[PDB]
Amino acid sequence: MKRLTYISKFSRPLSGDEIEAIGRISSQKNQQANVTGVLLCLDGIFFQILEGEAEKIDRIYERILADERHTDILCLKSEVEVQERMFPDWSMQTINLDENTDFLIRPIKVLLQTLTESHRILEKYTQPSIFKIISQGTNPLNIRPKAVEKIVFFSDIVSFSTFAEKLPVEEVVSVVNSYFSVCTAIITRQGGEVTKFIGDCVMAYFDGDCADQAIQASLDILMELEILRNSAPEGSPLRVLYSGIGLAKGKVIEGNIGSELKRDYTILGDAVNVAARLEALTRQLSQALVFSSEVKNSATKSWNFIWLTDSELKGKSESIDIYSIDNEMT
Template sequence: MVVAVATGALEGVEYWSLEKFFEVRGTQTPEAPVVIVTIDEPSFIELNKQWPFPRAWHGEIIRRIAADKPLAIGIDVLFPEPSSLGEADDEALGAAVAAAGNVVLGSAPRFEYRPGVGVQVDQNIPVKTVRGDAIVAPVQMEHDDVDSHVRRAPLWLAVPDEASKTGFKRVDAFDVQIYRLAVKAGLAGAPLPKVDRMLINFNGPQQTFPWVSYYKLMRREGRDPEVEPGFFRGKIVLIGPTSDILHDVFPTAFMRGENQMPGVEIHANVLDTYHRGTYVREVSVWISTMLAAAAALIGAALVVRLHAGRAFITAALVWFVLTIFAYLGFLYFDVWMRGMAGTVGLFLGYGATVIENFIREQREKRRLSQFFSPEVLREVVRHRDDNSLGSTRRLVTVLFSDIRGFTTLSERLEPEVVAEMLREYLSEMTEIVFRHGGTVDKYIGDCVMALYNAPFPDADHAVKAVRTGLDFQEKTLEVSKRWEEKLGVQIRNGVGINTGEAVVGTMGSRQRLEYTAVGDTINLGARLESITKEYGVGIIISEFTHKLLKDEFMTRELGEVTVKGKSQPVKIFGVLPASLRKYPRAALEAAATLVIVGGGEECHATTRDISEGGMAVGGVPDTWGPGTKVEVRCEGGLLPKPLTATGVIAWRRDALAGIRFTELGAEAAPAVADYVATRGR
């Protein structure tokens, strides 16, 4: 680890962490008054000209900017060759540069070693006609060897100088020259860093600084420039390409991959860093090396001193503290501490503990899998050091649901078919239980027992249990439809729900344990499920569950049941979806007679009210339970128009049934709506 840090082997991950610090900090508003005049795609379109633009245009731009008396003007465009449009084109630009008096032109000296020839230098400075006596400074970006990202800015570069003994001379960088001109013109800012190169404190992605398209400063086709006079007063103005097609874009902390930052905006970030005095200071490599060594020792100590799980938590806490410490140093003091080396050292130190813990846990899971279901097993392993799954008394809501008449149904079918049906049905029901945060306690044949508020607290346990029951009813109809098409059988289910205290935890023998609940609360839940058919409803809940429900459910009191061993009877309620409440009802002046067809039978029933959503009817056969599809007809007496509708039995109580309409006839729909609107309540 020490060697890796000292040799720079971890530079890539260190730079990655620095970029993450920038991302977490986010975009900050620049303080330096920098404005960028962008050579961009809109300018190519508006000016109807591709690159390069005539240099006389640049001269016109500079004159317009200079008229506003900016602090300094930097041109991030190279003019190493005479203009293809002739010397007059160069002279127009040169005259504008000279007249402004505060322009810095860019250069890009390149050095190339050729065997047998030596070092060849390409000066890449503006031609004499353009530069005149203006300041010329190198604009090169410094690319890191690891990933070619631009993170640092040199404050000076060595350029060829025949008069020097070394053949080179030290020249201040482009941004330094611009900053000095701005300070000389009155900009109040921090002094330049006393370093050779610095880490740039990037403000954000592109366009963090104001952009003005090049064409907006040009007079064209009789149109005046779009930028108001005085806009550039007291500003540092940079002119440079931002279009990707000019290939002057680079990866930076905020912009990587295909979306990179224009070089001219990197210069803007450098200038703002100078102005704030907030260049990012790097902690010594030797300090980072010592940090990595110390972290590795801490990791090793955790392996020796602590349990594997606690070692992981402690190591993660140490890593978190180191990361926060490093980030706060970056955020408030502009200091970059190479923390990834310490992180790698720390995790290598306790890596053996993590591996050992994993192997031991897998061995323990294999041993315990014969006792627990997968759901409970995960919690047993997770809480194996405490007694959170031990038997305790707690408030729970229990749900029982089974298929009505399944024993008779199974006698008609082959065992393999029954097994496949059960697998499909129980899988659907289990998914619903899990979706509402319940725990499947057990399957008893076709019966599902589910618990809520166990093993972990859930304030809405009663509500979620009832939602589960309603979804059970809906999903059972879907399953029944599939089975009717495949096997010619239909199914209905009943759901019983109760809330109360029970003993919950791992129970059983020394040979086999399971996570379950026992007590009168559980027994009453099972009893409620068993009487759903008797009351002709799909779901029955106890008064204890009913007290905990919210307004999203519509309930109907069904009566009372006597619980074995209890002196007081318990009130019970049927549950309907709250969506039925959105239909106002209208009472009829007299009972109306209906013809209803359902389940292969036809009956004459009566009703005393109606809504757009359905009606309550009396006199339907006892065999028509919730879910039975029906057709309703009333030729006259009920409405001005004949009533025709299809629907489904939503609830039953003795001979009374609730029909939920699935479709009203074309003439009946407006007639019902009008009737309810004038007489509804």
């Protein structure tokens, strides 16, 4: 028996009778799948708890995510291996709190709207990786630091300073946000983790043995930016949006770094400097992507590697061989 707690936002106003409809059909289908649950709503928020044989709970969740009447689904708690039902009588109890006027419910309702509204805001300033840890029972604050090998990804906008100097405030922030959205979408898709924004710079990291995914994410970004420059409206700043990318591999510390006020779950190590140095090198070269030989040698696909005989490393130890990929992008 799995059990699943999630909250979501109405995709549009819903009458109490439309919510009742969701309640009824949910009851008929849950009663068949052995599922019991409770569906709460409170001023445009859905809350649901759903429990049953995991396999069937997974299918039900999957089509719940497919329903157009709510959006911003966030799984708050996923319990596996539960040995007893919380609400064993209700296939689906629908509790509409907008209409419930009991006086013991008065205070509990106002807190719930306060905490949920607050929590929804904090979500957008949080990395979605923390929520994956939270949902699955682990308190991320209690993870202990560890030394681990990573591919470190650095990307930085070329000559961002001139956007700022010649463009309105709203427009400059639109350019950098568009860039971070393109990069974030592609890195996450390839298994990487965007861990920090540093001005016009994206710092992400991949598992140590995911050099092929790092290289492919980098090539797809460069492809996505080319398509974005060519397709932008007449006179759009997106037409002159270029990026460099540097990749390096090495052993870094991963853990909670910060003060009492505020911590980050992120990495720390020399491989971060190297990837930053490699990314800056791309201003010197005609290639937009450069990466270390340890990245080259950790790739398993037969990439079209090109050896950059001009290495140029400063602040490093042994001379660093720099490679790129030879294609029409570079």
